[PDB]
Amino acid sequence: GSHMGPVEILPFLYLGSAYHASKCEFLANLHITALLNVSRRTSEACMTHLHYKWIPVEDSHTADISSHFQEAIDFIDCVREKGGKVLVHSEAGISRSPTICMAYLMKTKQFRLKEAFDYIKQRRSMVSPNFGFMGQLLQYESEILP
Amino acid sequence: GPVEILPFLYLGSAYHASKCEFLANLHITALLNVSRRTSEACMTHLHYKWIPVEDSHTADISSHFQEAIDFIDCVREKGGKVLVHSEAGISRSPTICMAYLMKTKQFRLKEAFDYIKQRRSMVSPNFGFMGQLLQYESEILPS
Amino acid sequence: GSHMGPVEILPFLYLGSAYHASKCEFLANLHITALLNVSRRTSEACMTHLHYKWIPVEDSHTADISSHFQEAIDFIDCVREKGGKVLVHSEAGISRSPTICMAYLMKTKQFRLKEAFDYIKQRRSMVSPNFGFMGQLLQYESEILPS
């Protein structure tokens, strides 16, 4: 519900909306140490003492999001190494932030787009990348898998 | 423009932080803002950490040294470059840099200060900060 | 010195004495998340909200400290993996805690006893394992390193 917050994807990886990124007490309770914002608007909300990375990407099929997969994945892996927790987020937490997490599951966990998608779908049912992004995920799949 | 303290560590002001072109040319990959205001300026695609501290002797800045140092070591390990900055680039950001030289390179407060002094002469931590730096020296170094 | 505290060995590994383990504000400033106590006495000091492991060993040549090396090392690697920091300590911070740190350098970084010892010596000069422990360190070197 709306009383809920970011969902856990992996121990070090959470997914969520812009609203979730603004609930500081909530992020503190989860021990979130970094924010990877994928929208186009910044919110100083809960930014202090936190590893932050902004990779603005509008939610459109015209938007190229796959070319930023590497930067985003490196960031998440950085947090992983330093043993912290990142909350990857975007405006609604439906298209962008979940597209990135899928890319992550594929690149570091060898999941297939289908497996990456259901896995995230199981924790945040409303998840749904715009047709352009899903398209880029498909090309991305072919590139990193046999 | 920002001055190079170490290959992976640059020191500057809020203004310097907003000059993207300049950052890009130096291959700046991260920013550590030690002021109380954020400037959406050149914040995209960059490891950013914001530790707000006011430039007053009443301000506790020493207890944020480790967090700041670990952050700079991270950029170090990832082979990048951090631009530590604060409003004027005189008190806050340079105090962190002194702390960094002391903790990682074993510099003594005196040597640390002179080191940064040579790169940016105007540098000068408020007397409270110099005080915390001295207390800091005694804690991370022999007698 | 005296106003001084734990010394850094590795980013996730600090060495020190029982006294250093009791200076909570100091541990908090360094971001110490765990304590590995190798003395025979526990000190409720700064124990809250911290990964703690107690491996009691007396500081004597008759004491077997080498067979606890792996337990200590796994513990340190755990903190390392979780991205935290352990302060390994013993009463004086001269024999026990530094012996463990040497063993750690040998097992995970492949340092030879000589290099491990100098490395820790440079950061805490008074370091000096009792002759029994140095002996065990030697047996230990031959067991985990080529010749």
Residue A11 to residue B77: CA distance in whole angstroms = 23
Distance from CA of C146 to the nearest CA of A (A): 30
- The residue of chain C nearest to residue A84, with distances taken between CA atoms, is C83
Tell me what percent of chain C is helix, strand and coil, each rounded to the nearest 5.
45, 15, 40
Distance from CA of B43 to the nearest CA of A (A): 7
C66 residue type, one letter: S
Residue C26 to residue C6: CA distance in whole angstroms = 9
- The residue of chain B nearest to residue A33, with distances taken between CA atoms, is B49
Distance from CA of A50 to the nearest CA of C (A): 15
B51 and A47: CB-CB below 8 Å?
A: no
Distance from CA of A136 to the nearest CA of C (A): 33
- The residue of chain A nearest to residue C81, with distances taken between CA atoms, is A83
Dihedral pair phi/psi, residue B49, rounded to 5°: -140, 130
Residue C66 to residue C137: CA distance in whole angstroms = 7
Taking the CB of residue A8, how many other CB atoms lie within 10 A of it?
Answer: 12
Residue C113 to residue C129: CA distance in whole angstroms = 12
Closest to A5 in 3D by CA, of A52, A16, A42: A16
Judge contact between A123 and A42, C-beta under 8 A: no
C81 and A84: CB-CB below 8 Å?
A: no
Vertex C49 angle, CA B52 and C102, to 5°: 95
Which residues in A lie closer than 8 A to residue C82 (C-beta atoms)?
83
> How many cross-chain Cβ pairs, A to B, lie less than 8 Å apart?
41
Closest to B101 in 3D by CA, of B88, B91, B90, B111: B111
Q: Which of B32, B39, B46, B49 to mutate to test the interface with A (most CBs of A within 10 A)?
A: B49
Which residues in C lie closer than 8 A to residue B70 (C-beta atoms)?
11, 31
Helix ranges (DSSP H) in chain A: 24-30, 69-81, 96-109, 113-123, 131-144
Tokens of C74: 């796994």
Q: CB burial class (10 A; 0-12, 13-18, 19+) of residue B23?
A: buried
Q: Which residues contact C44 (CB under 8 A, 6 or more apart)?
A: none
Residue C36 to residue C52: CA distance in whole angstroms = 6
- The DSSP symbol for C30 reads H
Could you list the beta-strand ranges (E) of chain B: 3-6, 9-13, 30-33, 47-50, 82-86
Residue A103 to residue A38: CA distance in whole angstroms = 13
Residue ranges and CATH numbers for the domains of chain C are: 1-147 (3.90.190.10)
- The residue of chain B nearest to residue A56, with distances taken between CA atoms, is B44
- The residue of chain A nearest to residue C82, with distances taken between CA atoms, is A83
Vertex B129 angle, CA A47 and B92, to 5°: 40
Distance of CA B31 to the CA centre of its chain: 10
Judge contact between C84 and C33, C-beta under 8 A: yes
Residue B1 to residue A51: CA distance in whole angstroms = 25
Strand partners for B44: A54
Distance from CA of C25 to the nearest CA of B (A): 9
Which of B45, B48, B50 lies closest to A71 in CB terms? B45
* Residue whose pair of structure tokens reads 């991205």 in the numeric block: C83
Q: CB burial class (10 A; 0-12, 13-18, 19+) of residue B118?
A: exposed
- Characterise B132 by phi-psi region: left (phi > 0), alpha (psi -120 to 50), beta (else): alpha
Q: Could you give the angle at which helices B109-119 and B127-140 cross, rounded to 10 degrees? A: 130
Judge contact between C124 and C7, C-beta under 8 A: yes
